[PDB]
Amino acid sequence: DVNTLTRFVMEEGRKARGTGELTQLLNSLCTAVKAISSAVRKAGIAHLYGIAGKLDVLSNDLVMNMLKSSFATCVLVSEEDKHAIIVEPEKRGKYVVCFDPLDGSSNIDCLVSVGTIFGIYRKKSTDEPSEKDALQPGRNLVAAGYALYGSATMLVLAMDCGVNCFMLDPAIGEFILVDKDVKIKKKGKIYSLNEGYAKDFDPAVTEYIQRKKFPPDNSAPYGARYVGSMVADVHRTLVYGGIFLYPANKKSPNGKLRLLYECNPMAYVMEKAGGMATTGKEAVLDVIPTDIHQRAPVILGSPDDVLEFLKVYEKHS
Amino acid sequence: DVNTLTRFVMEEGRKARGTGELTQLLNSLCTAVKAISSAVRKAGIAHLYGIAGKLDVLSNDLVMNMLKSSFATCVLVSEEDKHAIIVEPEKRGKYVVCFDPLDGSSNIDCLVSVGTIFGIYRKKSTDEPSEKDALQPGRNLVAAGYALYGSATMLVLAMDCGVNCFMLDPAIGEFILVDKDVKIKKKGKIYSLNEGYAKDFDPAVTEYIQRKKFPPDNSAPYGARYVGSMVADVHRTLVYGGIFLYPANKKSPNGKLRLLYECNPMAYVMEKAGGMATTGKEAVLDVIPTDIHQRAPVILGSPDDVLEFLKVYEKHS
Amino acid sequence: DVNTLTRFVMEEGRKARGTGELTQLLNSLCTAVKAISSAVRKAGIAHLYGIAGVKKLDVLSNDLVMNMLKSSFATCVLVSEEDKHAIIVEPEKRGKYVVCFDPLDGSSNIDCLVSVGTIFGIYRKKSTDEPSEKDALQPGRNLVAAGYALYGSATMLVLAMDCGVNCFMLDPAIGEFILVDKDVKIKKKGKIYSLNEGYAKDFDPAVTEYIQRKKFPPDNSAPYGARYVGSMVADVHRTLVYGGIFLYPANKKSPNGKLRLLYECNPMAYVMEKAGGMATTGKEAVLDVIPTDIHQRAPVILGSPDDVLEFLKVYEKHS
Amino acid sequence: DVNTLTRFVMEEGRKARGTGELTQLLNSLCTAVKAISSAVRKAGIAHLYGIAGKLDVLSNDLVMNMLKSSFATCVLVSEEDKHAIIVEPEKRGKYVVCFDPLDGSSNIDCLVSVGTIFGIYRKKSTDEPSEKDALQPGRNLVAAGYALYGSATMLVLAMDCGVNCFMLDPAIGEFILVDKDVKIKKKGKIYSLNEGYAKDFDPAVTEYIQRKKFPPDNSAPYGARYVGSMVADVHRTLVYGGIFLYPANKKSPNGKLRLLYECNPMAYVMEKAGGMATTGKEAVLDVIPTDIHQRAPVILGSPDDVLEFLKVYEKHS
Numbered sequence A, B, D: 001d002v003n004t005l006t007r008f009v010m011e012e013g014r015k016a017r018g019t020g021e022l023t024q025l026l027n028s029l030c031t032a033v034k035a036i037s038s039a040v041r042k043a044g045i046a047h048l049y050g051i052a053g054k055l056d057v058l059s060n061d062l063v064m065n066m067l068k069s070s071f072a073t074c075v076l077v078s079e080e081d082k083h084a085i086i087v088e089p090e091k092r093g094k095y096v097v098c099f100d101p102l103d104g105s106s107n108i109d110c111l112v113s114v115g116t117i118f119g120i121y122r123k124k125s126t127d128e129p130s131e132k133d134a135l136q137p138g139r140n141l142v143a144a145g146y147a148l149y150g151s152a153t154m155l156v157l158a159m160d161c162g163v164n165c166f167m168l169d170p171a172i173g174e175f176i177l178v179d180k181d182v183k184i185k186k187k188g189k190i191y192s193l194n195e196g197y198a199k200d201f202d203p204a205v206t207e208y209i210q211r212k213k214f215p216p217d218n219s220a221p222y223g224a225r226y227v228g229s230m231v232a233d234v235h236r237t238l239v240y241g242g243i244f245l246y247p248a249n250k251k252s253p254n255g256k257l258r259l260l261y262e263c264n265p266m267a268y269v270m271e272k273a274g275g276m277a278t279t280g281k282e283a284v285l286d287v288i289p290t291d292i293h294q295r296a297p298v299i300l301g302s303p304d305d306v307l308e309f310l311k312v313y314e315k316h317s
Numbered sequence C: 001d002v003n004t005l006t007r008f009v010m011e012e013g014r015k016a017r018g019t020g021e022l023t024q025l026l027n028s029l030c031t032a033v034k035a036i037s038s039a040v041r042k043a044g045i046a047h048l049y050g051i052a053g054v055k056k057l058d059v060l061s062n063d064l065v066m067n068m069l070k071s072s073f074a075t076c077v078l079v080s081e082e083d084k085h086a087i088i089v090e091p092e093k094r095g096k097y098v099v100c101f102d103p104l105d106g107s108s109n110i111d112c113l114v115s116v117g118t119i120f121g122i123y124r125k126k127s128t129d130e131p132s133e134k135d136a137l138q139p140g141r142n143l144v145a146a147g148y149a150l151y152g153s154a155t156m157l158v159l160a161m162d163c164g165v166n167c168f169m170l171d172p173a174i175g176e177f178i179l180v181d182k183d184v185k186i187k188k189k190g191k192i193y194s195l196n197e198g199y200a201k202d203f204d205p206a207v208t209e210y211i212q213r214k215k216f217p218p219d220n221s222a223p224y225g226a227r228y229v230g231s232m233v234a235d236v237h238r239t240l241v242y243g244g245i246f247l248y249p250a251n252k253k254s255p256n257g258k259l260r261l262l263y264e265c266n267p268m269a270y271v272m273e274k275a276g277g278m279a280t281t282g283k284e285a286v287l288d289v290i291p292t293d294i295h296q297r298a299p300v301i302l303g304s305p306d307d308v309l310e311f312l313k314v315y316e317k318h319s
């Protein structure tokens, strides 16, 4: 029998005997994603060029407004805003949302894939809502996932019940369930990082890459892929398996990607699909943050691939 | 004034005082591109999953059927067909079209960007149409380009007048002109190739890539990008500058990419934009082919970068 | 703040403390309405004419509505204009609601691109017996929600429940029904009457007089305008938006009318009453007729209350 | 073989050895019609109702701007404009267009069908464009037709070669040919007019309608249909046969519909499909206009029905 995003969430909600507040949140976010998808594919661009005589800003406004108006949220952190946004009292609900409304949009000039990344927490302290409420470790996530605006638009939703993939059918504006309860390959054959920082790599990263190009067990070398847009690179890793790396360099001594709305959501999806995500020193989901725009190094993907890198890391003390 | 692809081609055609066959061909090609785009974005997928109780094949059928019914073609070469297709006599016109209807479609499960690549020639003899009519050197091209089905759908068209970029507005089905007479940066800061196969690199490729990462002076090392879909990587090279390599090695003395409907159309776009495209031994556009599916190595992008690669390449000759 | 159909129905459901079964039903029906809309607007018709080198629209609409309702797990008996007998939902998918619907009303003239629509009425099963066709034989008084989708110049969903009538506009760029008209009410009296005057030779004597009063008013005031699309959902929706009267009455050749009581007359009667209008057969209220056959017919006269009352006065004068 | 509007017009135009100005015109008009359809079906209305925090006017702006920028027109007459619009000198071409950009839009609150009506003339002087260029009789039309925004969107185009019907496929923004060289039924079973104004009827209109309800030859009476949107009522008459009336009476001796951009294009379509269109006294296409906004009565449809009406009309002298 056919299933949609809304219907899947309502049945999981009735199964868990919840109040419906989370369903209202997710229904609002998906409405936002459909408007973002339509703008990213350039519907109406002809009016901007005079047929009748900014995208990361628009995306941020769409997500902010649909979440506020859902009556289900209280604190909102966005890549686009210097401080956390506190929802007004008459619209407050019980959830905290960290999001990147249009990740990769700096290179959208070349029509690279871009995406929306989100992670949802229950507000945990009873204090008055503040920026501190978004500083929970990723272990605390209630739901997280992403929308990828690639050759098609897909919504990946990870919850306690697992990971599920929904394809936007733009003819009816419905997210159709196409892949149920997905799991990542135990081991893949692709590695992904920006090798232009090879001069600054720590010795452990240098060796691990060398093992991928020149395998000691004369097996086939890995192929390399690096789009430069995290949502595209992570989703390929989920669908095909392998490993994705963004380690620290001289320009970025604490790493480059953001912990709250880039690293933690992707780590949650990976673990719910049976994968891994580490900083080298610890699991990403175990890092306790102190600043909402703080950075972290990340190595994630199929479990056999992340484990092999951790052994090389251990060799270099 | 706002401009569309159909309006622009009509103006160039009336300017050159042509008969209109080339305009009919390009109009039919664009109807195919819009139908491919609609299917690539998964319109109507809900009916496939039972709401009421092939993509590379379909792309090929769309381009093939729209070209045959244009009355403007006589020989059609496609990546999908072993032999050249000869249009039935009642529908023959004067142009030869070589095309890849859905390049990158092998990895379409991960929603990577995909594309359609085409190059259009004038039939040169009055003999009866045969496969030989497609064996012209790239220098002979009348028009070439690609459609990128990325975060948005864009059509890039190169002719004698230069390179122009058109954005598909899906709300009305029109290609809107957004970048006129584009030129590539004289020197860039990005190199693009599959470094996972470094074990097999030609020694000149090894040394050249090492100089991008480890500059002998004190300039900044280049960044790395590799989507793995030719249309996406080539379009980024056009927009941002730099270099793209799919070179020859000892295991593949002729490269991997196909000359007729991958290498030549892209070489043509680059040269019309003030860039370069070499095999290492000569310009891609000067190769005279002997087989419709023959392969060729290609190194293309900003001219200062391509010239610097040839200096290292010649050092190892 | 913006509001959508799903968001609006979730709030009324949370407010009334329901289990969610009705919300799943309506959300499933709304998905079916978007797929019908997409097909009615001829998306993909290029493929039927050979661009790369199937079913009738009323069959496909029936298949879409039937399939989404079954898969909602919210229904047990389904009556459709297209099926001779009531459909009894299999046990593993049964819920507590009975739905009577016309999946594509007016579709016989869809060759001229006239407006077409989907009509629906939803009941709660009343007996504890095993579900059967009898469960669909309730009077209109018992309806829980009813409405229609009009596939016109735009696609709109009109939903009537106890809280009133609300109008939602389909935004095809994102596939959402956007709330655009809240708590709608019909004018007390209008300026348009709607019926097929081509069959006047067979008119009841009372229908002849009332129409005569509309064209040639005894107090030489201004005549009414006449409009008749011939598609019930379009004529009834115009009656709601502009006011006036719609007639499909009984005569000597057809003493019971022509329109179907369960899935045409009753749902339109319910919408009208919730918006402050009237709907009669001439002898009794549409919503009070007790049916004996799921495909039985009934005459209908509906619209603005002053207009329907003036008709009843003429009908009674002719005994 | 599949055919589209732009491909069909180019083929007829090359067949006639024309310069391409009319094709550039009709292609530009077809871009405006697709933009009007998109707005009429309410695409993007969510942004109007605040998701991120006029229609007849937009239609006139779309048609005016696409026609001006086509370089194919010099004078434009619109239902929305008091005086003719004169195209500025650098954009002038040789054609005159009379149009109603959104007919029936006064009742768009109830979502009744609406449409666009157009008629195209070659201009008259070689001097300078002026209003007089739009004052030609319907016999002079080069092409005319309408777009119906009903349950689907259809463009009906009549030229010298006949009447052809194109269905807009919104998934690709292309007009598909679906009914070729259409001809009307010789006699129908439906009459169409506003009977609420019967108190004002001409005696012949009264007698003719009486014959439809109470036939003297005891045959079956006709049915009645009246949408109130001329494009919808006229299109039903073409597809099903019958008669459509908006006749003269004492209060409106010249009718209500507009001659230049409502009566003439529909009269042309009817005659090209083998039907008739009269004022009662003469053929609509033979009226010579003196004012761009002058009115005329119209009776059109199947020939046996119009002849039967004229017989009653002639009996009353």
Ligand SMILES: CC(C)Cc1ccc(S(=O)(=O)NC(=O)Nc2ncc(Br)s2)s1
Residues within 6 Å of the ligand: A009, A010, A011, A012, A013, A014, A016, A017, A018, A019, A020, A021, A022, A023, A024, A159, A160, A161, C019, C020, C021, C023, C024
């Ligand atoms: C954690 C995941 C497996 C999904 C979820 C768990 C809880 C929720 S919820 O708290 O939002 N509850 C509801 O939505 N209840 C409803 N009642 C009627 C309807 Br119709 S849905 S979603």
Ligand SMILES: CC(C)Cc1ccc(S(=O)(=O)NC(=O)Nc2ncc(Br)s2)s1
Residues within 6 Å of the ligand: B009, B010, B011, B012, B013, B014, B016, B017, B018, B019, B020, B021, B022, B023, B024, B142, B159, B160, B161, D019, D020, D021, D023, D024
């Ligand atoms: C190669 C570039 C300079 C562009 C082109 C050159 C030639 C053509 S063409 O041969 O196709 N000619 C036409 O299209 N003529 C037309 N006449 C009326 C219309 Br309306 S279009 S396009």
Ligand SMILES: CC(C)Cc1ccc(S(=O)(=O)NC(=O)Nc2ncc(Br)s2)s1
Residues within 6 Å of the ligand: A019, A020, A021, A023, A024, C009, C010, C011, C012, C013, C014, C016, C017, C018, C019, C020, C021, C022, C023, C024, C161, C162, C163
């Ligand atoms: C009074 C009528 C106009 C509206 C209704 C009455 C009953 C229903 S219902 O049975 O469908 N209940 C729910 O849906 N509850 C929900 N819980 C969580 C979510 Br989220 S919605 S709607």
Ligand SMILES: CC(C)Cc1ccc(S(=O)(=O)NC(=O)Nc2ncc(Br)s2)s1
Residues within 6 Å of the ligand: B019, B020, B021, B023, B024, D009, D010, D011, D012, D013, D014, D016, D017, D018, D019, D020, D021, D022, D023, D024, D159, D160, D161
């Ligand atoms: C009268 C109707 C039956 C159709 C028409 C007749 C003439 C025209 S025309 O003046 O527009 N000529 C062209 O369009 N020529 C072209 N050459 C190349 C291209 Br490609 S189109 S349309």
